[PDB]
């Protein structure tokens, strides 16, 4: 079983910083896509950042210049460095992973895994 565990969450003041990490139970260097999602109370999940196998990254416009995603292949850990946090950043942050390039979405049960999430609270 592939398992994800998020850490590094908590309460911070506006403009503060947090580094989220997700430990993966398997080697991550060949994992196709590793994502950070977030879900604010009463709202839908949004994709925050994505790290692809080929080294490329995608960011939501709302977190560009503030958030940084990266893989630590040696530790099998996905990081989310969060600087200049805002009240609107308050959400449960969830790590997500797609082991395989799955164009037709035929191997969801085998390739897609979610973490339980880590709560991030930004207020003064």
Can you lay out the helices and strands and say which pair or pack?
Elements: E1 4-7, E2 10-12, E3 18-24, E4 33-39, E5 46-52, E6 57-59, E7 67-72, E8 77-82, E9 91-98, H1 108-111, E10 112-114, E11 118-122
Parallel strand pairs: 2-11
Antiparallel strand pairs: 1-3, 3-8, 4-5, 4-9, 5-6, 7-8, 9-10, 9-11
What's the helical proportion of residues?
A: under 10%
What's the Cα radius of gyration?
14 Å
**What's the helix-strand series?**
EEEEEEEEEHEE
User: Main beta sheet, described?
Assistant: 7 strands, mixed
Q: Provide the domain count.
A: 1
Which strand-content bin applies to the residues?
over 45%
Distance N to C terminus: 40 Å
Q: How many distinct helices?
A: 1
Structural class: mainly beta
PDB class: immune system
Keywords: single-domain, multi-domain, llama, antibody, influenza, broad, neutralization, immune system
Assembly: monomeric
Entry title: Crystal structure of anti-influenza single-domain llama antibody SD38
């Amino acid at each position: 079983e592939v398992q994800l565990v998020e850490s590094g969450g908590g309460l911070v003041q506006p403009g503060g910083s947090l580094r989220l990490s997700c430990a993966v139970s398997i080697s991550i260097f060949d994992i196709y896509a590793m994502d950070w999602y977030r879900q604010a109370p009463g709202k839908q999940r949004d994709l925050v950042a994505t790290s692809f196998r080929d080294g490329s990254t995608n960011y939501a416009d709302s977190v560009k210049g503030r958030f940084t995603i990266s893989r630590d292949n040696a530790k099998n850990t996905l990081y989310l460095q969060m600087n200049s946090l805002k009240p609107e950043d308050t959400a449960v942050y969830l790590c997500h992973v797609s082991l395989y390039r799955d164009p037709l979405g035929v191997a969801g049960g085998m390739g897609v895994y979610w973490g339980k999430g880590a709560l991030v609270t930004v207020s003064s």
